[PDB]
Amino acid sequence: GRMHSAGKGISSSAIPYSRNAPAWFKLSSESVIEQIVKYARKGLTPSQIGVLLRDAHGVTQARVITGNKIMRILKSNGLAPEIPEDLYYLIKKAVSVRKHLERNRKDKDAKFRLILIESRIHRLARYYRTVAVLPPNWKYESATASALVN
Amino acid sequence: GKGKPRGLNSARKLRVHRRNNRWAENNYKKRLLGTAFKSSPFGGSSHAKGIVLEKLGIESKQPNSAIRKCVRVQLIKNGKKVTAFVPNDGCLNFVDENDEVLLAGFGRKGKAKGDIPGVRFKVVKVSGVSLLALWKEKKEKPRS
């Protein structure tokens, strides 16, 4: 179940049995790509990119209709970020929690939550180190953390 | 399932974990700690002979009532004083003070037998003849 909660939720997406399609789309990969990069240069994350494309532009997925998943495109275009989106948002989060700790110092639950979040960050970065997307050393430092999210 | 690791590569845990657990097993620990050689009045040896210091009339445990005839012996090999029961009718008159007697276990592996308290041993020979043979008058105790 959940990694840090004791939750047992299944609320997921549900990708269709349809590696091709849709018969009503009509717009060509080459076009949609130049919209992804348009947004990625306007500073947008893969997650919240395919959210706009799923919504306003009627593009269902990106692995279909272009044959490539969104981030893979950004990297080809040199719009690859510094550190990954998960790791990032985790690090941003952990930062803000600590920033709350620094004034509210009796918030024992706060401290608890930071221990959870930063567990996650390290577990992540460990893997990311394992598959060469972060340098051999790297590691998440708290003191320097606020810097890495700018 | 089961609460024990089942990995094909878990031998170490399964191995140390039982080695760890053999200790709750009394007979094992006695053997490993050499209680036998240390705390036991005999060496671990099956028999010991010592010299009879005094005669004792230890009374029985409940719900019995009698005066079990015993002797405080002092073991030669390690000067230990332990007392031993003297079996059969009036055999207590076969042993004398300062008389050098062979003791044996009560066949309980260290525990006390029956209602005789504190007594974990028995007299088997006395002045080196056999208590059994004396009681049956087929042998005679050599003079003191």
């Binding site: 990708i15 049995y17 590696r19 | 094909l8």
Partner: protein
């Protein structure tokens, strides 16, 4: 987290049999499952079974025909030397006159009768009777 997949398969079958059903669902669908299901069908302890193509790992619908008592897995898939098959069959089979202990040999997956013939061995997958 799922661990054996060939465990939860055989269990569902086992479970569904006991409760009087003549059909099961098996998610997910590993090849090891099917090859096992094959071995288990070659001696008719199950009937027809049909793969279902999710764009994922699969499902299976197996038809049951009674006469199954237990289809078991053995974990960890121990190492069995050739004259040790004799020993497992001794332990986990009902009688000398039937039942099966299917393995994994380099010569594919097969029941213990078969390996006995081809003179091969390896790990143990489980058993059927």
């Amino acid at each position: 987290t799922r661990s054996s997949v060939l465990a939860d398969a055989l269990n569902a079958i086992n479970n569904a049999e006991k409760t009087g059903k003549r059909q099961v669902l098996i998610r997910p669908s590993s090849k090891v499952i099917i090859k096992f299901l094959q071995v288990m069908q070659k001696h008719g302890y199950i009937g027809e079974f049909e793969y279902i193509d999710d764009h994922r790992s699969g499902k299976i619908v197996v038809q049951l025909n009674g006469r199954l008592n237990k289809c078991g897995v053995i974990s960890p898939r121990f190492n069995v030397k050739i004259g040790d098959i004799e020993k497992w069959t001794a332990n986990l089979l009902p009688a000398r006159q039937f039942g099966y202990v299917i393995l994994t040999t380099s010569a594919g997956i097969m029941d213990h009768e078969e390996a006995r013939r081809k003179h091969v061995s390896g790990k143990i997958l489980g058993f059927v009777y």
